[PDB]
Design a protein around this ligand. Structure first.
Ligand SMILES: O=C(O)c1ccc2c(c1)nc(NCCCCCCCNCc1ccc(-c3ccccc3)c(Cl)c1)c1ccncc12
Length: 330
């Protein structure tokens, strides 16, 4: 069998909390009236929800309604319980109300409206400071919700909202978020392919907040190298290969030996032998400004197979890659 694993941080927080904090299936929901909210325009479609721009008609205030696509009651309480526990926290989206439509009784979540900015002109006026800054901001949310014993589990660019004019960032979609419990065994069919961590790729189930950190390493490696996506898999199985071909097969098998993962037999033919490439293989004429010895040392300290080896969010924020944003904050 496999080896059990525990987070190197925030390991038993949820155990030391009042039962109801994490027992979301027993959480009671006081479903409002969606008629307090008039839909304006369709903001996006996801796999378990649809998102509209709406107006609360008792202050003319601007909100966002997230009609939930039909799912097990269970998953809605999870996402609500996590939102309510994280409410107020640095850079976390603000759950404003929980309502059902009178006719459908289909549940929908009201959120704080954030003005995001067109990602077109976002990727063009993105400076090597801008990345540092906004990445620190995502860590504020990541370190918060982790300290609160919660894993986002879907940290991708589609889930980061930037109001560049105010420098306001909000980590969003918590529909996959879960409570960390030492010993608990979690599903591997979570997050999207391009940010899935190795643990997910080999079907290792006792992971933790380290999952969020790989995702973020992928996001960071995309922007400093100007390669969207950075690990470009055809399928889930080839995604590990696109990762192997950069991190080496050596550390990969060692990862597997250390946790004794029953590596799936397909793999045993498509991986192979590849060295641990040197990062400067990926810096070229168009991207050398975002790249710095500081940046690469942080990036190398996030993209590891050993989930236990990757930095923690707090450990990440004290890295020297962020010395400049910290000073200017104080
Ligand atoms: O369900 C939920 O919870 C939820 C809650 C609230 C809202 C929601 C869903 N949906 C909304 N509408 C559509 C979402 C897709 C656009 C998301 C921008 C894409 N992201 C841009 C970027 C730019 C730069 C970087 C970057 C920065 C530093 C380093 C590397 C990368 C990154 Cl990472 C992301 C919405 C709209 C208005 N108000 C609230 C919400």
């Amino acid at each position: 069998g496999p080896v059990p694993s525990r987070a190197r941080v925030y390991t038993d927080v949820n155990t030391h909390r009042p039962r109801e904090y994490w027992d979301y299936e027993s959480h009671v929901v006081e479903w409002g009236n969606q008629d307090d909210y008039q839909l304006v325009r369709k903001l996006g479609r996801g796999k378990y929800s649809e998102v509209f721009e709406a107006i609360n008609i008792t202050n003319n205030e601007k909100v966002v309604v997230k009609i939930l696509k039909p799912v097990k009651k269970k998953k809605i309480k999870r996402e609500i319980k996590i939102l309510e526990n994280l409410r107020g926290g640095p850079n976390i989206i603000t759950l404003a109300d929980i309502v059902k439509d009178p006719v459908s009784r289909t549940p929908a979540l009201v959120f704080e409206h954030v003005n995001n900015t067109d990602f077109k002109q976002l990727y063009q006026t993105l400076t090597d400071y801008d990345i540092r800054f906004y990445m620190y901001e995502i860590l504020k949310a990541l370190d918060y919700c982790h300290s609160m014993g919660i894993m986002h589990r879907d940290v991708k660019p589609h889930n980061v909202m930037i109001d560049h004019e105010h420098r306001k960032l909000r980590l969003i979609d918590w529909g996959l978020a879960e409570f960390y419990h030492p010993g608990q065994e979690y599903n591997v069919r979570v997050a999207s392919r391009y940010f899935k961590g190795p643990e997910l790729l080999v079907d290792y189930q006792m992971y933790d907040y380290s999952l969020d950190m790989w995702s973020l390493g992928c996001m960071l490696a995309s922007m400093i190298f100007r390669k969207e996506p950075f690990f470009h898999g055809h399928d889930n199985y080839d995604q590990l290969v696109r990762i192997a071909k950069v991190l080496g097969t050596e550390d990969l098998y060692d990862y597997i030996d250390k946790y004794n993962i029953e590596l799936d037999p397909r793999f045993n033919d498509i991986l192979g032998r590849h060295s641990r490439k040197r990062w400067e293989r990926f810096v070229h004429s168009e991207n050398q400004h975002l790249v710095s010895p500081e940046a690469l040392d942080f990036l190398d300290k996030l993209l590891r197979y050993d989930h236990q080896s990757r930095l923690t969010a707090r450990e990440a924020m004290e890295h020297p890659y962020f010395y400049t944003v910290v000073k200017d904050q104080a």
